Amino acid sequence: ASTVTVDWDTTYQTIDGFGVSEAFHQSNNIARLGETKQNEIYDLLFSTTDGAGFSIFRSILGDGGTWGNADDGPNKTMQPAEDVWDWNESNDDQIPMIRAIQSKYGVDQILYTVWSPPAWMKTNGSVVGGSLRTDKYQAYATYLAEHIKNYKSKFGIEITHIGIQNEPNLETSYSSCRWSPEELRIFMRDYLVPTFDKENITAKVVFAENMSFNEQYAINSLNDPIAVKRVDIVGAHNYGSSYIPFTTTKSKGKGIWMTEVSDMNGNDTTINDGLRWAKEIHDFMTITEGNAWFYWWGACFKTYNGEGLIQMDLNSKTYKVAKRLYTIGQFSRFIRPGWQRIEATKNPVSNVYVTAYKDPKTGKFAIVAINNGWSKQSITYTLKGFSPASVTPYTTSSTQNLEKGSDITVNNSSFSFELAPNSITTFVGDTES
Ligand SMILES: O[C@@H]1[C@@H](O)[C@H](O[C@@H]2CO[C@@H](O)[C@H](O)[C@H]2O)OC[C@H]1O
Ligand SMILES: [Cl-]
Ligand SMILES: [Cl-]
Ligand SMILES: [Cl-]
Ligand SMILES: [Cl-]
Ligand SMILES: [Cl-]
Ligand SMILES: [Cl-]
């Protein structure tokens, strides 16, 4: 019987949201399941009433590669040659899904990440590996600005966040482009910042998304007086690393987005894998104090690993939902863009981890409690600085998927709940009536 204290007036970072991606034709793989299952998958991902309520959507800016195939491969680029633009909305197979989920679910944060500049800008003449030619830095700055401008003016899509390079540390067997940190500062200071200023770009920059979770690729730009003007967000993946503070990023008042993580080595779809990712979010919120957290694919055609939250079998036209969709939903469905983390006893007892969030504009709040141990844990929650009448529990476990429970009466700013082993429960409430 342990105690968690939640303080309404001790506040931390603003939460920008939670995201997924459908890059590399996975958006088209959803549609191939048929209209009925397509809408079911949109619902599971983005609905705030019967889904995970993801609030950010990450997509690939087409590079024109020729690798892969139609099930997993690149999209045509809107600038296939230095002297040719091709604003054909059919080039980007993510546009139909973006329009549908912005309309139906109000998803209004749209991140486009570049995996590679087009081949004619690359040192090896290919979108696979290599680097950006130094005599193509301006062409790439123009490339990025023209995409933000013309996705709006031609396709009606507002790109609110632009990711300038996915994993600049890595050359892969698919779309990739290697940068050094100093090459990124030179690109920001001498090309991106003056081009974005000249074109009056208001989209925020998610800085080069390091494969490992550190700010090393951003330190050079963050300390540059010109580049720092548009280092709006420092992005990073969490493949093979752990959650640490981004010291220089916080000193410059910038945001932190963990824009991709998944299990590429195993295929665990049970609550144990789900609680692994819930614990990653908890560490992200409390160690790094980050602002947005992303899984990799929302739905994908890989039934053999954990790169997506939903595994689609294209041959039988079926899909299977892993527990990680719901364990991540325990955060993402309730913590909307603009919410604010508040103080809660982060570790009340062994294997129990707690965070808390509030909406400063409605008085709504959410308390997310993880129990990734083997023992039932009775917890008494003391609410400091606010007094709701009741809380509503939502639980995910080996037998429950974001299951709404009976309301729990709050007696003098205190309520108790027994956390089941290997489970996660969110308590949701409102202070204004
Ligand atoms: O099927 C392939 C995917 O597995 C691959 O996913 C990559 C996983 O590592 C991440 O760091 C990368 O950002 C992500 O692209 O993408 C290519 C696709 O063909
Ligand atoms: Cl591109
Ligand atoms: Cl890369
Ligand atoms: Cl899972
Ligand atoms: Cl992602
Ligand atoms: Cl899996
Ligand atoms: Cl809200």
DSSP symbols for 387-408: --SEEEEEEESSS-SSEE---E
**Residue for token digits 């429970």?**
405
**Residue for token digits 């956390």?**
419
Whether residues 371 and 233 fall in one domain: no
CA distance linking residue 346 with residue 286, whole number of Å: 8
Give the ranges where 340-416 is alpha helix by DSSP (H).
none
Half-sphere exposure of 118 (CA within 13 A, CB side): 22
Give the contacts of 366 (CB within 8 A, at least 6 positions apart).
Answer: 334, 335, 339, 356, 357, 358, 426, 427, 428, 429
Give the contacts of 420 (CB within 8 A, at least 6 positions apart).
Answer: 371, 376, 395, 397
CA angle in degrees (0–180, nearest 5) for 195-201-207: 80
* DSSP state, residue 15: P
Tell me, in angstroms, the distance from the centre of ligand 7 to residue 106's CA: 12
Of 337, 367, 383, the position where a domain reaches its end is 337
* Paired sense of beta strands 2-14 and 377-384, if any: parallel
Would you state the structure tokens that stand for residue 102, as one six-digit string? 């912005």
Angstrom distances, CA of residue 99 to CA of 89, 128, 157, 352:
12, 29, 8, 40
Specify whether the CB–CB gap between 332 and 107 falls below 8 A. no
**Residue for token digits 């604003």?**
87
Whether residues 182 and 99 fall in one domain: yes
Q: Which residues pair with 25 in a beta bridge?
A: none
Contacts 24+ apart (CB under 8 A), 407-411: 410/383
Whether residues 46 and 86 fall in one domain: yes
CA distance linking residue 289 with residue 328, whole number of Å: 17
Ligand 1 binding pocket includes 25 (Cβ within 6 Å): no
Whether residues 102 and 182 fall in one domain: yes
Ligand 1 binding pocket includes 207 (Cβ within 6 Å): no
Strands in 334-376 per DSSP E: 340-344, 352-358, 364-371
**Quick check: helix, strand or coil at residue 348?**
coil
Of 337, 361, 378, the position where a domain reaches its end is 337
Give the ranges where 77-192 is alpha helix by DSSP (H).
95-105, 137-153, 181-187
* Residues near ion ligand 2 (Cβ under 5 Å): 61, 63, 114
How many domains in the chain? 2
* Residues near ion ligand 7 (Cβ under 5 Å): 336, 359
Ligand 1 binding pocket includes 260 (Cβ within 6 Å): yes
Gyration radius from the chain CA atoms: 22
- Other beta carbons less than 10 A from residue 90's beta carbon: 10
CA distance linking residue 226 with residue 33, whole number of Å: 48
- Report residue 212: phi and psi, to 5°: -100, 150
Would you state the structure tokens that stand for residue 299, as one six-digit string? 């739905």
Determine which residue's CA is closest to atom 17 belonging to ligand 1.
Answer: 174
Buried b (16+ CB within 10 A) or exposed e, 206-221: bbbbbbbbbbebbbbb
Single-letter amino acid code for the residue at 345 = T
Would you state the structure tokens that stand for residue 104, as one six-digit string? 């139906």
Whether residues 92 and 228 fall in one domain: yes
Q: Is 88 exposed, middle or buried (0-12, 13-18, 19+ CB in 10 A)?
A: exposed
Phi-psi region of 115 (alpha: psi -120 to 50; beta: other; left: phi over 0): alpha
Of 318, 337, 356, the position where a domain reaches its end is 337
- Other beta carbons less than 10 A from residue 380's beta carbon: 14
Question: Following DSSP, what letter does each residue of 170-190 receive, concatenated?
Answer: ---SSB-----HHHHHHHIII
Any idea of the CA torsion for 65, 68, 74, 76, to the nearest 10 degrees? 50
Element (H, E) at 248: helix 247-251
Please report how the helices 95-105 and 35-46 are oriented relative to each other, as an axis angle in degrees rounded to 10: 60
CA distance linking residue 213 with residue 234, whole number of Å: 10
Which domain covers residue 416, as residue numbers? 1-15+338-433
Q: Which residues pair with 287 in a beta bridge?
A: none
Which atom of ligand 1 is nearest to 67's Cα? 19
Short-list 89, 91, 119, 114, CA closest to 25: 91
Tell me, in angstroms, the distance from the centre of ligand 6 to residue 307's CA: 7
- Report residue 408: phi and psi, to 5°: -115, 125
Single-letter amino acid code for the residue at 366 = A
Whether residues 323 and 383 fall in one domain: no
Whether residues 401 and 277 fall in one domain: no
Specify whether the CB–CB gap between 329 and 349 falls below 8 A. no
Buried b (16+ CB within 10 A) or exposed e, 335-345: bbbebbbbbbb
Ligand 1 binding pocket includes 237 (Cβ within 6 Å): yes
CA distance linking residue 46 with residue 325, whole number of Å: 11
State this model's resolution in angstroms.
1.5
Would you state the structure tokens that stand for residue 18, as one six-digit string? 């939670």
CA distance linking residue 321 with residue 41, whole number of Å: 9
Whether residues 289 and 346 fall in one domain: no
Whether residues 367 and 332 fall in one domain: no
Give the contacts of 429 (CB within 8 A, at least 6 positions apart).
Answer: 364, 365, 366, 388, 390, 391, 392, 410
Would you state the structure tokens that stand for residue 410, as one six-digit string? 């709050």
Give the contacts of 258 (CB within 8 A, at least 6 positions apart).
Answer: 213, 235, 236, 237, 238, 284, 288, 290, 292, 293, 294
Would you state the structure tokens that stand for residue 197, as one six-digit string? 């200023």
Would you state the structure tokens that stand for residue 233, as one six-digit string? 């967000």
Ligand 1 pocket mutation pick from 116, 307, 314 by most atoms within 8 angstroms of CB? 307
Whether residues 295 and 358 fall in one domain: no
CA distance linking residue 201 with residue 146, whole number of Å: 10
Whether residues 319 and 356 fall in one domain: no
Ligand 1 pocket mutation pick from 24, 29, 239 by most atoms within 8 angstroms of CB? 24
What is the C-alpha end-to-end distance of the chain, expressed in Å? Answer: 32
Whether residues 173 and 134 fall in one domain: yes
